[PDB]
Amino acid sequence: GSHMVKVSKFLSLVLRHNPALIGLDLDANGWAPVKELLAKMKAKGHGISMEELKHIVETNSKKRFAFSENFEKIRANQGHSVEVDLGYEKQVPPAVLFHGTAEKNFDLILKDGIKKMSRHHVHLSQDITTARKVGMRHGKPVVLSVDAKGMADGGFDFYLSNNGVWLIDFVPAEFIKV
Template sequence: MDYMKLSKELSYALRHAPWEYELELDEEGWVEISQLLVALHESPGWRNVTEDDLQHMIAVSNKKRHEINAGRIRALYGHSTPQKISKIATQPPELLYHGTPVRAVSSIMEHGLQPRQRQYVHLSADMDTARQVGQRRDDQPVILRVKAGQAAREGVLFYHGNESIWLADVIPSRYIEQG
């Protein structure tokens, strides 16, 4: 089985278009695995997918994008569905990072970091992760430093995604540094 392809399909279903699979995310983004499997089994490529395959897909992935608990599965970040996934705000580390294409920097320094198509702004816990995120769009991305601790103390909300990804609401540019 192509577990990377399965992971992409699940990210699409659980982050962006659950209705295409006749699924409804609960407030925290969970769906019943049994319901997800019914939907997947309708498509010829995924007729034989089992819960064990979903566990294996998570285990072999280079990023922790999904989690399973008590017969349910959800995406940990990345959502663009109209109803915002509810998260518990948490104090972040003092510094977080954001990798972005050169062409986006002037707009970010003017308007702050915005969620754009997603529900939350995505930040990286370390520069390496930020570089990888930025390289999806630019070979030589800019790594911005976000004064997350200070922003949180002054009222910006941050949420834990996984061990290397944090989420936030709009981050005003006064908390963002270049270079």
């Protein structure tokens, strides 16, 4: 099902920043017992079977999320804000993306994040120009400044519209610079 970006982002997150977050922890050379992840992340209600996680490590990630060749440990390297393109095509602008959306959406934005029916293709924008322009649909868009490099690296995917619009999966206000 479509949650592999959420899975890969996650896996990258846990094995890089705060592994302790899920009961998982990082080893001395920057690894983690895969069995720790498989059982735990499954138990977390994400149904990770080993067949599933190998699928993410080997097919989707590799340079991002590495795996022992013997599949015992997993790790995530990151610091790689290149076109990671997690099964999609990410177009990475210079530094940041400015997304405008009405300040009547502010509560929802800040709590839940930039999301509507997201999973694949929700609205994002590159410049304040577009932020304002798209937000003219309501009035005064608040400019959610989301980092392109951070998002690309973290495992958040974003596409480019033929018109020059950006489409995102989702961006947490928790990470956005409102």
